[PDB]
């Protein structure tokens, strides 16, 4: 009943007798599978989990300079040198500035000048790689008919609630078997290698905000970088040496590139970190379901004899189906709930389609609640529940 209300809902009906059913499970979406003589089961992709990520390259976006020094020489006196030129922690660049008698040298010509400054990174971002073996998908299976509204918001105690089952698929084990109790088991043979090309996508970690970026664009980041887990390369990207009229050389820091990083990531998929595992909010997956080992719980029950009373008024869902919640005052349960659509009230020719396949009541006590989903035909129709004179009927209109 959890698929009722999602706009990305896809209805599939497999061939009669066949065991294999191909479905395409999207993130945040819900897939309802139906089959002849087989119950209605909801399959949903819940969350994408990637573990054991490896770093590739770290870029520096916020730095600070200190202990800036310079050294100058007269023309034809060789190049200028400072002690700091030997330290890989500093950034140095040499130029030629005009010199003469007005500057303190005896000859006119190009004089060599060197300027060094200490590079130290304050705030950095880190890029991590995704190993295909360390990839984990979470899929939820659920059948229509039981598990009323009281478990709609519930995330603790799922091992005790037997109506739902958790299945987790990785490229290390693309097969799974879920025991659904009364209905048997369901098989999942998914295609992990052909789900989405993650070899050309990298995991980007900013200041507690995370994106998914293309592999080539991250190698093109114009910031000081160093590979592996120190020694920074291309420090020049963050330090502007302003030469004023080819005479003086000063050093200035550029501001925080957080604005340039954020504007560039506009369009990439945002993600979140849950401890050591990374959670994604995007990605699709194709799967093949084995319908063989699935069975209908209670197909042999008898028909409910007493009357029903509407608990909630039939309302129309987004995709045109109608949800009805009814109360049964009878005591001869468990019994099969007689539901159908009718065009003529004398013939009662069953038209339309039943979403909750073979709806049944399992509780044996009176005043038991139960809820089902219906797909009425286009236009005017009648929802008839029960048998005999005590039956309840409601008029419906579609399109």
């Amino acid at each position: 009943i959890r698929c009722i209300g999602v706009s990305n809902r896809d209805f599939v009906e497999g061939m009669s007798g066949g065991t294999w059913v191909d479905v395409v499970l999207e993130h945040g979406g819900c897939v309802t599978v139906m089959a002849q003589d087989k119950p209605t089961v909801d399959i949903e992709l819940v969350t994408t989990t990637v573990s054991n990520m490896a770093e590739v390259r770290s870029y520096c976006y916020e730095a600070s300079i200190s202990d800036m020094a310079s050294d100058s020489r007269c023309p034809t006196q060789g190049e200028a040198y400072l002690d700091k030129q030997s330290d890989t922690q500093y950034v140095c660049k040499r130029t030629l500035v005009d010199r003469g008698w007005g500057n303190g040298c005896g000859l006119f010509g190009k004089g060599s000048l060197v300027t060094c400054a200490k590079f130290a990174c304050s705030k950095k971002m880190t890029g991590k790689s995704i190993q295909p073996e360390n990839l984990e998908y979470r899929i939820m299976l659920s059948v229509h008919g039981s598990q009323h509204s009281g478990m709609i918001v519930n995330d603790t105690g799922h091992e005790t609630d037997e109506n739902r089952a958790k299945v987790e698929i990785t490229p290390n084990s693309p097969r799974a078997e879920a025991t659904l109790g009364g209905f048997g088991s369901l098989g999942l043979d998914c295609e992990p290698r052909t789900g989405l090309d993650f070899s050309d996508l990298y995991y980007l970690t900013m200041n507690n905000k995370h994106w998914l970026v293309h592999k080539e664009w991250f190698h093109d980041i114009p910031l000081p970088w160093h590979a592996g887990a120190p020694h920074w390369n291309n420090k020049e990207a963050l330090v502007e040496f302003k030469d004023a009229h080819a005479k003086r050389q000063t050093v200035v820091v550029l501001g925080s590139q957080e604005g340039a990083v954020h504007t560039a990531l506009a369009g990439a998929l945002e993600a979140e970190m849950d401890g050591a595992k990374g959670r994604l909010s995007s990605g699709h997956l194709k799967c093949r379901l084995k319908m063989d080992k699935l069975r209908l719980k209670g197909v042999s029950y008898s028909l409910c004899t007493a009357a029903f009373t509407f608990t909630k008024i039939p309302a129309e869902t987004l995709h045109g189906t109608v949800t009805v919640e009814v109360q049964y005052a009878g005591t001869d349960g468990p019994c099969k709930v007689p539901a159908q659509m009718a065009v003529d009230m004398q013939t009662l020719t069953p038209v339309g389609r039943l979403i909750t396949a073979n709806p049944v009541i399992t509780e044996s006590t009176e005043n038991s609640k139960m809820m089902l989903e219906l797909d009425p035909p286009f236009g005017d129709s009648y929802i008839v529940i029960g048998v005999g004179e005590k039956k309840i009927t409601h008029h419906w209109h579609r399109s």
Partner: antibody, heavy 120, light 112 residues
Framework: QVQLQESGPGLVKSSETLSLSCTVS????????WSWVRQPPGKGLEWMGS???????TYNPSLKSRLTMSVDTSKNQFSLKLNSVTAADTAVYSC??????????????WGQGTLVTVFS | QSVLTQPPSASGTPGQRVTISCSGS????????VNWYQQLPGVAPKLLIY???RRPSGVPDRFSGSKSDTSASLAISGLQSEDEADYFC????????????FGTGTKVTVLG
């Protein structure tokens, strides 16, 4: 369509191990919880144990200390083994396919039953 | 297994309607169907009622079963001498791992 046939020793010695087999004919082995029942003369009906083709087992609590059950998927057979039988366990044993859930329009199916006597 | 309560014996004259009660609890009938079997001495039990009101093909129409919340009942119209036997109600229970529970059984005797 469906037929069940019991087969096993008609007479067994005391303190030895009792084994009985049940063959399924004309139906899929995966549609029933295959179970064993017995009737000691003078007492009432007692369900011994139930097993599914996957290997899920559940035994009568008063007999788990003494009872083992087996299932063969390829031969459409399943067998029963009872250790350390007494003179009290002389009864009419019968195999059948119970319905833990209905799943079947024709209801449950039952075999023919056999008389096993423990003599000592 | 658990125990399902039944009366010891039910009596009647040839041609009467005889009823047999079957009292259980919330664990067995509160969540499962109930079946009826006709037991003869020295043979396997014979199926009479499954899903609590259905007769397998071949059972005479004179056998019928009804149920309530924690109770069930079996009715036989037109009692004849060919029905002298024991009758057992049995049902699945949702205890530790699932038990098939048999009742205490009730003997039907054509009064002499």
């Amino acid at each position: 369509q469906v037929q069940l046939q019991e087969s096993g020793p008609g007479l067994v010695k005391s303190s030895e191990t009792l084994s009985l087999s049940c063959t399924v004919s004309g139906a899929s082995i995966s549609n029933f919880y295959w179970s064993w029942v017995r009737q000691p003369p003078g007492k009432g009906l007692e369900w011994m144990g139930s097993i599914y083709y996957t290997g899920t087992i559940t035994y009568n609590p008063s007999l788990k200390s003494r009872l083992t059950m087996s299932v063969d998927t390829s031969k459409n057979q399943f067998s029963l083994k009872l250790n350390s039988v007494t003179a009290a366990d002389t009864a009419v044993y019968s195999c059948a396919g119970l319905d833990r859930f209905n799943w079947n329009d024709e209801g449950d199916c039952w075999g023919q039953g056999t008389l096993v006597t423990v003599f000592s | 297994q658990s125990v399902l309560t039944q009366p010891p014996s039910a009596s009647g004259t040839p041609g009467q309607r005889v009823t047999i009660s079957c009292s259980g609890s919330r664990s067995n009938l509160g969540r499962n169907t109930v079946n009826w079997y006709q037991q003869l001495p020295g043979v396997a039990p014979k199926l009479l009622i499954y899903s609590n009101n259905r007769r397998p093909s071949g059972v005479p129409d004179r056998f019928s079963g009804s149920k309530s919340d924690t109770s069930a009942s079996l009715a036989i119209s037109g009692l004849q001498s060919e029905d002298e036997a024991d009758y057992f109600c049995a049902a699945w229970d949702d205890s530790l791992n699932g038990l098939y529970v048999f009742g205490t059984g009730t003997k039907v005797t054509v009064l002499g």
